[PDB]
Amino acid sequence: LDPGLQPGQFSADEAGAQLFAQSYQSSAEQVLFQSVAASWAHDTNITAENARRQEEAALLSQEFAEAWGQKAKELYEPIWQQFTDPQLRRIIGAVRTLGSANLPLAKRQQYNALLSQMSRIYSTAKVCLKTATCWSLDPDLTNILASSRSYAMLLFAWEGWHNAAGIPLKPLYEDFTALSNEAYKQDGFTDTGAYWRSWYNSPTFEDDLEHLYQQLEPLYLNLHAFVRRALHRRYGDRYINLRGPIPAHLLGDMWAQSWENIYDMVVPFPDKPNLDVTSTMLQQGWQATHMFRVAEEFFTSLELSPMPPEFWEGSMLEKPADGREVVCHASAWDFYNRKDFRIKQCTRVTMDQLSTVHHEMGHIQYYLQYKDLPVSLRRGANPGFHEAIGDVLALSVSTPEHLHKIGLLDRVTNDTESDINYLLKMALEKIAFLPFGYLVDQWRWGVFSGRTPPSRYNFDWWYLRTKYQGICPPVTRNETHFDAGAKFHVPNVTPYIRYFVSFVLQFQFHEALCKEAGYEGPLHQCDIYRSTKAGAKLRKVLRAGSSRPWQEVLKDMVGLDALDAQPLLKYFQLVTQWLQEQNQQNGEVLGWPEYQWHPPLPDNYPEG
């Protein structure tokens, strides 16, 4: 570690702790920068030489983390918990927590190599059929899951991906879990999952989540039964069991996590205007550039910041056309130099991708708003806040009235049929996700705690997938398969519960900004576009970073200091009642009592 980057001396008391924290943050900025740059270089251009450089940057970050961490523990371990200043308790508390820097050198290198190899496997995995031709997840497999209605073709894509990504990840993921736990246990956590959960500073986190899910589950059950009936009408009594789980490949998405793509099959009133504007975007010839500019302009309408020149010059907004492998999974980047901020997204011209652009731009806007704070306060109030920002705007954007304003929809009527179509569409996107958003880290917490050893990785994954989502694998799986590994966030070792928290929080935010905007109608028809008052209220959250506990930031914004499902329920209320009525009238069974049921294979599986 460079002498400039090493800690000096400070007194062993709170006042010395303050100078320590100030000096730590000054040096951390340069270390953060080299790490992010090295990651960018790799993720936008996956090569062996780029991975090596990224691993060297990771090692440097660990050197830094060890030097300052050991210093924190040397001076403040017996006393920091009694420090009068809570903001200081949080920083010294962080710095004493070394993570992977607790590992000896050989194991650090092992750890960094594992993260690189898992990332490469997920992002370069292919499904091969000409016999030489192979499909990538993004865009090829994504498009198949989205627009193919051929049971056998969907199965080929689903099975191919899960096998390609999952099988070779398993041995690496076991090794990562052991090293991760080894590292965090030295910091005093029972396991890595306990550390991840501690970011929410709620002694009652898991219980709070379970109570939230209990209120939401009836909405999911009804949507599920309605959707399963729509699928049965298309795929027949052979492939769909009206009392069983839905086969996992028929919902529009590789993970059955958003059901927006099957909207045309489920839309209650097909003779109203088509609220999926994808085909209009194609007909009008929208490109990635347009999508990003349209998203930016919503942000500036609120008097939030435009994207800076560095963003437009540095960002990767389409999958490269040259012979280059990249991580296509979308992300938003802060380089920690208060100047460079970028999105990396393999943008496709679709309505859901337009919402995705807003999502990533929400992350950037957060970065732009808190860029002048001490480096340790450059985070969301909690990670769920960071995930909610862009989704909040996308809720206004997808309203039929807003789509009309941006030329994507001829004026729609204020009628009850159109409302049900819209709310059903929004349910496929938002309600359908909830079980998945909840289950992923239940699975991962069980793995980190040891309740789920490698011998039960897949058994427990599918237990959870069936329990919450009411889906089943369309082919037989066993413990050689590692289906959790075929989801980005697992091999990329980044937490998922933030998204469940985001989905509740975004409706709380939406309700608060709509009220602030002076809007008076139904919550699902609110468009905060051009509301500088809504913008000012959002800006206060963004500029706070993590300087204040999230419960207080939420209280100031929303009037409540806790996550609350009521705003989401309020938003969906009309379609919640409608689906319940329809399911009853149709004589549906809610849930999937035939829990053991799996679909048969197509007659000519796997060729076609």
Ligand X SMILES: *[C@@H]1O[C@H](CO[C@@H]2O[C@@H](C)[C@@H](O)[C@@H](O)[C@@H]2O)[C@@H](O[C@@H]2O[C@H](CO)[C@@H](O[C@@H]3O[C@H](CO)[C@@H](O)[C@H](O)[C@@H]3O)[C@H](O)[C@H]2NC(C)=O)[C@H](O)[C@H]1NC(C)=O
Ligand Y SMILES: *[C@@H]1O[C@H](CO)[C@@H](O[C@@H]2O[C@H](CO)[C@@H](O)[C@H](O)[C@H]2NC(C)=O)[C@H](O)[C@H]1NC(C)=O
Ligand Z SMILES: *[C@@H]1O[C@H](CO[C@@H]2O[C@@H](C)[C@@H](O)[C@@H](O)[C@@H]2O)[C@@H](O)[C@H](O)[C@H]1NC(C)=O
Query: Which segments are annotated as binding site for chloride?
Result: 200, 498
Does 525 sit near ligand X (CB under 6 A)? yes
What element of type H or E holds 586?
Answer: none
Task: Supply 471's token pair.
Answer: 């889906």
Does 47 sit near ligand Y (CB under 6 A)? yes
Please, what is the Cα angle at 462 between 195 and 232, to 5 degrees? 135
Single residue of 306, 522, 549, 591 touching ligand X by CB under 6 A: 522
How many other C-beta atoms can be found within 10 angstroms of the C-beta atom of residue 200? 21
What is the nearest approach in angstroms of ligand X to the Cβ of residue 519?
7
Active-site choice (360, 429, 511, 588): 360
Does 50 sit near ligand Y (CB under 6 A)? yes
User: Going by DSSP bridges, is the β-strand pair 471-472/246-247 parallel, antiparallel, or unpaired?
Assistant: parallel
Does 273 sit near ligand X (CB under 6 A)? no
What is the nearest approach in angstroms of ligand X to the Cβ of residue 581?
19
Does 401 sit near ligand X (CB under 6 A)? yes
Q: Is 360 a catalytic residue?
A: yes
**Between 387 and 441, CB nearer to Zn ion:** 387
Which of the choices Cl ion, ligand Z, ligand X, none does residue 495 contact, using the CB cut-off of 5 to 8 A by kind?
Cl ion
- DSSP letter (8 states) at residue 385: H
Q: Is 489 a catalytic residue?
A: yes
Does 577 sit near ligand X (CB under 6 A)? no
By CB under 6 A, the residues from 410 to 439 that bind ligand X are 414
Task: Supply 137's token pair.
Answer: 């997840």
Is omega for the bond preceding 606 within 30 degrees of 0, making it cis?
yes
What is the nearest approach in angstroms of ligand X to the Cβ of residue 134?
47
**Between 376 and 421, CB nearer to ligand X:** 421
Distance CA 493, CA 39 (A): 14
Active-site choice (329, 404, 489, 598): 489
Does 63 sit near ligand 3EF (CB under 6 A)? no
141 close to 121: Cβ distance less than 8 angstroms: no
- DSSP letter (8 states) at residue 78: T
CA nearest 358: which of 298, 275, 404?
Answer: 298
Which of the choices ligand Z, Zn ion, ligand 3EF, none does residue 588 contact, using the CB cut-off of 5 to 8 A by kind?
none
Distance CA 296, CA 307 (A): 7
By CB under 6 A, the residues from 246 to 285 that bind ligand 3EF are none
Q: Taking the CA atoms of the chain, what radius of gyration do you get in angstroms? A: 24
Distance CA 220, CA 468 (A): 9
Distance CA 59, CA 116 (A): 13
Residues 493-532: x where in contact with Cl ion by CB under 5 A, - otherwise, as a string: --x--x----------------------------------
| Residue 274: alpha-carbon gap to chain centroid | 28
CA nearest 13: which of 82, 98, 95, 90?
Answer: 82
Does 459 sit near ligand Z (CB under 6 A)? no
Query: 126: which strand partners?
Result: 136
Residues 491-530: x where in contact with ligand 3EF by CB under 6 A, - otherwise, as a string: -x-x----x-------------------------------
157 close to 68: Cβ distance less than 8 angstroms: no
Single residue of 25, 34, 45, 301 touching ligand Y by CB under 6 A: 45
Distance CA 35, CA 42 (A): 11
**Between 276 and 387, CB nearer to Zn ion:** 387
Query: 344: which strand partners?
Result: 316, 331
By CB under 6 A, the residues from 480 to 499 that bind ligand Z are 480
How many other C-beta atoms can be found within 10 angstroms of the C-beta atom of residue 84? 7
DSSP SS3 for 212: helix
What is the nearest approach in angstroms of ligand 3EF to the Cβ of residue 522?
21
Q: Hey, what amino acid is at 26?
A: S
Please, what is the Cα angle at 495 between 493 and 499, to 5 degrees? 140
Distance CA 504, CA 564 (A): 7
Which of the choices ligand Y, ligand 3EF, ligand X, none does residue 414 contact, using the CB cut-off of 5 to 8 A by kind?
ligand X
CA nearest 356: which of 345, 368, 340, 367?
Answer: 345
Distance CA 243, CA 597 (A): 9
Mark the binding-site residues for Zn(2+), compressed into ranges. Answer: 359, 363, 387
Does 318 sit near ligand Y (CB under 6 A)? no
The number of residues that bind Zn ion (CB under 5 A) is 1
Mark the binding-site residues, compressed into ranges. Answer: 200, 359, 363, 387, 498
Q: Is the dihedral of CA 450, 456, 461, 463 positive or negative?
A: negative
What is the nearest approach in angstroms of ligand Y to the Cβ of residue 46?
9
**Between 52 and 548, CB nearer to ligand Y:** 52
**Between 80 and 529, CB nearer to ligand X:** 529
Residues 324-343: x where in contact with ligand 3EF by CB under 6 A, - otherwise, as a string: -----xxxx-----------
Does 478 sit near ligand Z (CB under 6 A)? yes
Query: 135: which strand partners?
Result: 127
**Between 54 and 192, CB nearer to ligand Y:** 54
Catalytic residues: 360, 489
Judged by the rule CB under 6 A, the positions of this chain that interact with ligand X are 401, 414, 520-522, 525
Q: Which residues bind ligand 3EF (CB under 6 A)?
A: 329-332, 352, 355-356, 359-360, 363, 379-380, 383, 386-387, 391, 394, 433, 492, 494, 499
List residues near Cl ion by CB under 5 A: 383, 495, 498
* Residues at the interface with ligand Y (CB under 6 A): 45, 47, 49-50, 324
Q: Residues interacting with ligand Z, by CB under 6 A?
A: 476, 478, 480
